[model samples]
Target: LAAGAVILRRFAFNAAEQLIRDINDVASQSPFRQMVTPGGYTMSVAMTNCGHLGWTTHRQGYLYSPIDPQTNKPWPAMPQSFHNLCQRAATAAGYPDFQPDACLINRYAPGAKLSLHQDKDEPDLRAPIVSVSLGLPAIFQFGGLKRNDPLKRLLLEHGDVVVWGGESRLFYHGIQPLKAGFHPLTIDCRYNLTFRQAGKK
Candidate 1:
């Protein structure tokens, strides 16, 4: 974590159950799918979304859309609890007044990994991104603005929240391959909820 990034351990512990329920609701409306990147490789992590916009990748490139391509409809509305959680986490991370309009939900199974990349799809670069963890733990790779910059590895457990913005908004970050594990609630899956102000639809 850097000056603009802060990791709050067990930040969402109290409302973990409610968060899970909200995730299930979102998934029910727009089931998770592994999107193929513009390079033609399918992402290892399964993903879904809620709120005004959702991030997606395909033959063209990565972009945010108000519609869920699979369902041909808008993604589920962001649960009140999810919005409140993001606001609280963002405020705690020195990003008070952060109002995310999009939430990208990712589900990782054992062996799934995300390559280091900057979240630049959003037009509004001023808002910080608030990411909440659930289920199994994973190794988070946080690096500087450049892809080749030195990285900091951290073990992120369930209920942990990481907020990054300002100077580190475009920093390259990702998750290492998820190790095999059995969490009581999530079993073999690790879910990540990333809240972002992805601009107007």
Candidate 2:
């Protein structure tokens, strides 16, 4: 509901479904795996990626890379459908001509959660980030640019897209631990696709 953002409920679900299928097709090629953070804690969410670069973190550091360290090969290619959807959504959010080179797909099951963090790995912060939520609903925490700033909780459901850029680009955000639930499409899983300009490196 914020300016420069759009939430299309059930919008392009068929296309999004197909996009998910395509992502899953190559998912095993690289595999959806949990990563260990520099803090020595393993993330509860499982993740994979498609496009020119993929975001990754380990004891060494957090950054984007063209190759999947696990597979020793380039990350899966981003599907045209996914690319188009992200571009369209970004445009609708007042970010015309937006094109993303990285799609980070994250899957969360019951009790899975994402910690509060900022998406700062990308070299170019000028470009807005387009995130699409699918499957079960989740509570999204939108906080201020500073860690101590007040937080606003928002419920994001399937087909909902959130765009953050400009002054909001550095705002902290995260998802609460998913509650047990069932959905027709994803059963008990919640999938999220985050598109970013990771090729700027």
Candidate 3:
């Protein structure tokens, strides 16, 4: 971890069970689906969202939509446990006032990977991104502002959280392909909940 970025090991460990239930509840309202990038490739990670806005991708590129295009309805509201975990993690990471209005939940099966990318779609770039990892473990690649910058790989396990903002707000990061594993909670997949303030600044 570097300045403006911190990884709190097992920060959400105590609430893992409730969080899983919460994730399933959200998915019931807006099912997760693999989204296509502007380049016409389907993403390896399946995604859904909660809160007032949701991060989405398609032929036109990444966009935040107030409605779930698949469900034709508003995305599921953020679960209180999600809000609480994010707030606690942010504060622990030194961002006391951070409040995320969007929670983009992702599912990663064996062999699924997300390439390096920046979290810049949000109008409020100053707010830190609070990401929680549940279920299987994976290697998280963290880099500088440039895409080609040297990367630091961190193993993120269940209940782990990583928060970055300020100087590293535009830093590029991603997850490597997940290995096959079994988790009592998620069975055969890994789940991630990324919290961001994607609404109007």
| After superposition, candidate 3 runs with Cα above 4 Å error | none
lDDT of 1 by residue, 1-201 (tens): 486778899999898999999899999999999999888888999999999989987447998888999999999999999999998888888888788999999999999999999998887787889989999999999888888999989899999998987777888889999999899888889999999899753
Steric clash count of candidate 2: 0
Superposed on all Cα atoms, the candidates' RMSDs to the truth, in angstroms, are 1.2, 1.7, 1.2
Off by over 4 Å in 1: none
Tens-place lDDT per residue, model 3, 1-201, is 666778789989999999999999999999999998888888999999999999998447898999999999999989999998888888888888887899999999999999998888988788888989999999988799887888988899999998877767788888999999899988999999999988886
Worst 10 residues of 1 by lDDT: 56-65
Q: In candidate 3, which residue pairs get closer than 3 Å at backbone N, Cα or C atoms, i.e. clash?
A: none
The residue pairs that clash in candidate 1, if any, are none
Q: How much is the lDDT of residue 129 in candidate 2? A: 86
Clashes of each: 0, 0, 0
User: All candidates' TM-scores?
Assistant: 0.96, 0.93, 0.96
CA lDDT of each prediction against the hidden true structure: 0.90, 0.83, 0.90
